[PDB]
Design a protein around this ligand. Structure first.
Ligand SMILES: Nc1ncnc2c1ncn2[C@@H]1O[C@H](COP(=O)(O)OP(=O)(O)OP(=O)(O)O)[C@@H](O)[C@H]1O
Ligand SMILES: Nc1ncnc2c1ncn2[C@@H]1O[C@H](COP(=O)(O)OP(=O)(O)OP(=O)(O)O)[C@@H](O)[C@H]1O
Ligand SMILES: Nc1ncnc2c1ncn2[C@@H]1O[C@H](COP(=O)(O)OP(=O)(O)OP(=O)(O)O)[C@@H](O)[C@H]1O
Ligand SMILES: Nc1ncnc2c1ncn2[C@@H]1O[C@H](COP(=O)(O)OP(=O)(O)OP(=O)(O)O)[C@@H](O)[C@H]1O
Ligand SMILES: Nc1ncnc2c1ncn2[C@H]1C[C@H](O)[C@@H](COP(=O)(O)OP(=O)(O)OP(=O)(O)O)O1
Ligand SMILES: Nc1ncnc2c1ncn2[C@H]1C[C@H](O)[C@@H](COP(=O)(O)OP(=O)(O)OP(=O)(O)O)O1
Ligand SMILES: Nc1ncnc2c1ncn2[C@H]1C[C@H](O)[C@@H](COP(=O)(O)OP(=O)(O)OP(=O)(O)O)O1
Ligand SMILES: Nc1ncnc2c1ncn2[C@H]1C[C@H](O)[C@@H](COP(=O)(O)OP(=O)(O)OP(=O)(O)O)O1
Ligand SMILES: [Zn+2]
Ligand SMILES: [Zn+2]
Ligand SMILES: [Zn+2]
Ligand SMILES: [Zn+2]
Ligand SMILES: [Zn+2]
Ligand SMILES: [Zn+2]
Ligand SMILES: [Zn+2]
Ligand SMILES: [Zn+2]
Ligand SMILES: [Zn+2]
Lengths: 149, 153, 151, 150
């Protein structure tokens, strides 16, 4: 009984795309009874590791905390949201790849820096300025000299 | 590449029992290379996506913010509130149908433009004049002309 | 207690310029304790006539009902708020000028349209569409023709 | 010309009461020619001007919008919230000082840049990068070179 509108058991499937670099399956189902079509998300029953914050406190992985940081650094940058979601899926993929119960907050940060360098070099400097907490304006020139390698 | 352990593309499926009172599909998957087994949960996304506003800020979907815009354009028009609620439910339905975490504010606008075109063509012009921010009176005539060619056919 | 920052009772006055062609008095006041400068507008509270609505019901004059209708028509338009307030003050001035107990809602609407024609011609069409309740899309072309030829 | 009925310049004042907590001055004026007595209300102009956005659209002044921008630039900076509120009150003060019904969004941004230069020079660069929408990493070096002369 997959239909949520008329509550009919059989629901025919139309499409089956692979989103999130293979982490989940998006399907385009439609019920035979009513003329209503909807989307479904088949995801694997595994957990993203816990985050080991700067103050050694463990916290559940929140992809929105990760995303918001990136969007603040990308403020007026011409980087599409599909590229951002691709970078977020790749960082999650690499976090899963460790096979650890928990990952430090510093590891997530470095993986974002790794994506932002590819996405936008201005946005990368904006992120590093707060991520690495710049205490002098000279820290900006040092990150640029580091990036012109 | 559905495998989460070794990252192999092809993942064979073994079982498929409908669980959660038919609301979701619990399946058993097995990798072909690492030979591990895991559980899958296919659920319908029925939550309303976030709105990516004109200033790139994300905002929760507010059906009242959608309805007010329509009622301003539908001022003094003979379109009943049951037709308005039907149009609002159809726009929400189409927004759910995308299967997205967030939809742009522009997508919502285009969807109410097609509903208002069906509901009231005077109300549609009123909405389009602010939605598309008309800067000249000639823009009004252009929207009417690029409407009368459709009715002609 | 005229000071709004430190809440001191005595507030000394330095300047007094008559603004709005005598309709109000601008004055600079500077607190004695916090020493900060601010403006105070002395304006007259006058009687505005009652509004005889489309359904012949009388209603007190509403400067916000008047302003909101204009701002709905003036959506996304580049017309400054000083020009808007000038237009609203001129309509109120003309309403008072009749010297009548009550004015019809139709009189208010015509006066608003006279101001919107000067302010923004796109906004004028938006207002006229709801004000004159357009029943066909051809009503839009008629209002545009009614301005392009006879100014 | 304070008289609104006959339009006479000189208007004699008779009374001078106060709006509760001295927030306003009620007056009872009388014309010398038409001899009419009307009421006056002198109140402090504390409402903030409208913001003329980058796309010439007018918007009400939103303190949260102004403050949020500063707090994003002042992330992890040792600038206390009392200094931030002082800078926000000084920008609002300068906005009322113009005596205009509306101020451009660009003027607000320059006044924030003026405060952030005093508050934190790292935070000033962070604000300048988005405010002046940097399109190249070289824009950062240019803003720093501008600052190192003084
Ligand atoms: N719970 C979380 N889930 C996912 N990403 C997180 C989470 N907490 C932090 N992050 C991300 O980790 C990266 C680095 O974190 P950061 O360097 O800020 O350290 P922290 O110890 O989490 O402290 P804070 O967030 O207060 O700075 C950033 O991209 C941030 O958005
Ligand atoms: N949070 C929201 N939830 C639902 N509908 C919304 C929301 N925000 C805006 N809308 C609707 O989206 C459509 C188009 O929005 P619009 O073109 O106005 O752009 P915007 O970027 O949201 O800016 P604004 O609302 O200031 O015009 C309108 O029907 C509007 O009512
Ligand atoms: N009480 C009021 N005070 C001031 N202006 C008013 C008042 N009521 C209506 N107006 C204004 O009068 C103008 C014309 O009014 P309108 O043509 O809308 O007629 P109405 O009989 O008031 O009906 P409705 O407001 O329902 O349309 C508009 O600018 C409107 O904002
Ligand atoms: N309505 C508002 N009230 C108060 N401050 C505002 C308002 N809108 C913008 N600001 C502030 O004005 C300053 C400069 O604005 P900005 O340069 O961003 O231009 P804008 O035309 O408002 O466009 P944007 O949407 O990109 O901010 C910033 O400090 C911003 O926070
Ligand atoms: N204003 C900003 N400009 C550019 N990058 C920013 C800005 N604010 C945050 N970031 C980036 C770099 C930060 O290290 C990263 C994460 O932001 P941060 O405030 O540390 O919170 P967080 O996402 O770790 O969550 P929390 O504060 O709850 O621990 O986002
Ligand atoms: N006066 C009006 N006449 C006709 N249609 C209008 C009018 N005002 C708004 N609309 C229509 C077109 C607009 O693009 C749409 C949405 O209203 P708008 O004022 O833009 O705010 P919104 O609901 O999109 O977001 P927000 O609440 O964040 O401003 O409604
Ligand atoms: N969507 C709109 N677009 C443009 N102008 C509008 C819009 N809605 C209203 N107006 C303008 C033209 C209308 O004749 C005028 C008055 O608005 P209306 O909703 O009739 O209320 P009102 O101000 O007369 O109060 P009330 O309806 O309570 O009597 O405002
Ligand atoms: N991530 C950031 N790091 C540093 N400064 C920032 C950041 N984001 C914004 N700012 C500063 C500089 C911007 O010009 C200023 C205002 O932000 P902006 O996104 O332009 O919106 P705003 O406050 O003008 O409102 P809106 O865009 O909704 O009209 O705040
Ligand atoms: Zn069904
Ligand atoms: Zn495997
Ligand atoms: Zn923004
Ligand atoms: Zn109404
Ligand atoms: Zn004081
Ligand atoms: Zn609005
Ligand atoms: Zn008609
Ligand atoms: Zn007199
Ligand atoms: Zn924080």
């Amino acid at each position: 009984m997959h239909c949520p509108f008329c509550f009919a058991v059989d629901t025919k499937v139309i499409d089956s795309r692979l989103v999130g670099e293979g982490s989940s399956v998006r399907r385009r189902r439609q019920c035979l009874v009513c003329n209503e079509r909807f989307t479904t998300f088949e995801v694997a029953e595994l957990v993203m590791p816990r985050v080991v914050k700067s103050n050694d406190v463990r916290e559940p992985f929140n992809e929105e905390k990760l995303r918001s940081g990136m969007l603040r650094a990308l403020e007026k940058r011409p980087v599409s949201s599909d590229d951002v979601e691709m970078a977020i899926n790749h960082i999650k993929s690499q976090l899963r790849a460790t096979g650890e119960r928990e990952v430090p907050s510093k590891m997530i940060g470095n993986l974002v820096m790794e994506q932002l360098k590819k996405l936008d070099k201005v946005a990368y400097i904006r992120f590093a300025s707060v991520y690495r907490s710049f205490e002098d304006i000279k820290d900006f020139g040092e990150e640029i000299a580091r990036l012109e390698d």
